[model samples]
Target: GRTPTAEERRIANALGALPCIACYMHGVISNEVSLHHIAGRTAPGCHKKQLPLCRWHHQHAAPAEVREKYPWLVPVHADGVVGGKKEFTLLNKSEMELLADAYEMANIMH
Candidate 1:
């Protein structure tokens, strides 16, 4: 799996500035924290880069029942993979805009 770069860390930290949303609690970089894909990529057309969750949430907070209920949450790649589906979806333009707004608000608060 690919490790997070300095730039990615900066981007993540900037994003962590959100108000209501919880910042990357695990750490600053993706590698330090943890990332999860909301949808499973069983076949083609399954885009990667879904959601970025903390280590604890990805491993513990996400209950087995949830995965059982939503099979799509299961990841295509094996556990510990850099990018795998665990209940995250690719952010669209609108989603990114909303995230950006939250980040800006977080920055203001800080």
Candidate 2:
């Protein structure tokens, strides 16, 4: 079988608790944020290896960079059966940037 209780709260706290690290872009939380694995799941010490990435940057590079040139990228590996090309999603300039209030941005991801 696959990984047990993959989406369990006991495990995905960072997923739920932490805002997307790439770029939340909004002063408030939205449905756009998601968990991103800085360390691939197969890697050792992967249990606490997640960072918040917006739905967009989760599959692509940071909006702060040029996609074709600097893609931070998600991990895409064999499904234990097959393989294919792996590509990160792309974000535009307007799609990026957050105006953090000195107070609100102070303790983000808490």
Candidate 3:
């Protein structure tokens, strides 16, 4: 219900500095990253439960692209609309697993 605290801001920035977890799984480290809130930013006290993801993996991934480039990942993409999170999370890792990876990277950034 309140604005993010300074620690939260720092963690967010540090996560942004890290590469996308999905891309990292594919042997690529993309810096074009943003925080993907796991429980959503609107969720109460869930700011830290986030992961970094680039535009491609976070959104705008077509089925053809997914099949060609990330066949190992979920067939569906886009973490912006309804069912997106479910599909995105199905990419071989649970939300908590992704968040744990994010925290590890964030620690390295720190």
Candidate 4:
């Protein structure tokens, strides 16, 4: 059966939670909504498929260098996936706060 993939199901659930990050205004949440691969598939350490994200926030999130360096923290991967790289969880308190602030700014502008 051509059922939805695990990534698809995880993203669907996240969106359903109304998580309301900063970029909510950039796009609407819908069944047909597109998820973006923030790091891009060709980038090193990124997933082969696109991750679900509203169009607006996708643009506003991390830049290429950041994505490459901190692939793990993007909130899109399922547990136990090989080659998992995360930024948010690995960062020190100050670094994490900085990332959060960046996201907050993106949210405010969106």
Candidate 5:
């Protein structure tokens, strides 16, 4: 079994406890964050490199009319469903930047 090592598991758990990195950048905090490998899960040391995203930011695109409700999301929108990590990075923070934030926040949660 290619189970994650203990260190990897701990890192993943820590990331999972943090707010969605994108949402955090948007001035929101949420405990509903989920772990997302910055690199693919099978990549070398990938488990050690993860970020957090709420299900919306993790999978779905922001509906075109969403900004009508949350007017703050103007020219830049949160649409991970279509943009994926690349657009997530461009719209919010770089993956590594958020990963570092994850590390800092994870340290605090311990």
Candidate 6:
């Protein structure tokens, strides 16, 4: 893992600006939420690339369930995000776009 850079707070701020792309269906970012590296496991600054997901989705959401239900919610990884039958969980069709927007916005400064 890498230490935080004073210049990279963009990702953190962007995450807070949005809601948990995982559990919140158009909700605001809450204290219970965290910025998840879709990779979950990645290199040092790779954490700079992240998504706003709740504790469940970020720490315990099951990929099998995600693929079965929210097929639109695909959590990408550095290598690959595995799930049930080669697919997985993520966000809404429209919601994914929202998440992407926030992610891109934050990444711009990262």
| Model number with the top lDDT | 5
Worst 10 residues of 2 by lDDT: 94-103
Candidate 1 on 44-110: residue-level lDDT in tens?
3222223343443344333567655533333224355422322332311222333444445435331
TM-score-wise, the better of 1 and 4 is: 1
User: Model 5, 102: alpha-carbon shift in Å?
Assistant: 0.8
lDDT scores in order: 0.36, 0.38, 0.66, 0.36, 0.67, 0.49
Segments in model 3 whose C-alpha atoms lie over 4 Å from true places: 63-66, 72-83, 108-110
- Considering TM-score, where higher is better, how would the candidates rank from best to worst? 5, 3, 6, 2, 1, 4
RMSD of candidates 1 onward, in order = 10.1, 9.9, 3.7, 12.8, 4.1, 6.2
> What lDDT is obtained when candidate 1 is compared to the true structure?
0.36
Per-residue lDDT of candidate 4, residues 1-110 (tens digit) = 23445754554344334432323332323233344344444443333223334332233344557647644334333233321224322431222232343344334221
For residues 1-110, what per-residue lDDT tens digits would candidate 5 score against the true structure? Answer: 24688978887887787887767777888668667766776765688887787766666555668745643332222353355555556667777887887788778332
Q: Write the residue-wise lDDT of candidate 2 on 46-100 in tens digits.
A: 5344555454444432333543353433222222322212332222111112212
lDDT assessment of candidate 6: 0.49
Model 1 CA deviation exceeding 4 Å by range = 21-93, 106-110
Candidate 3: give its CA RMSD in angstroms.
Answer: 3.7
TM-score (C-alpha, index-matched) for candidate 3: 0.75
Scanning candidate 4 in windows of ten residues, the lowest lDDT window is 87-96
Backbone clash total for model 4 is 7
Which scores higher on TM-score, 2 or 4? 2
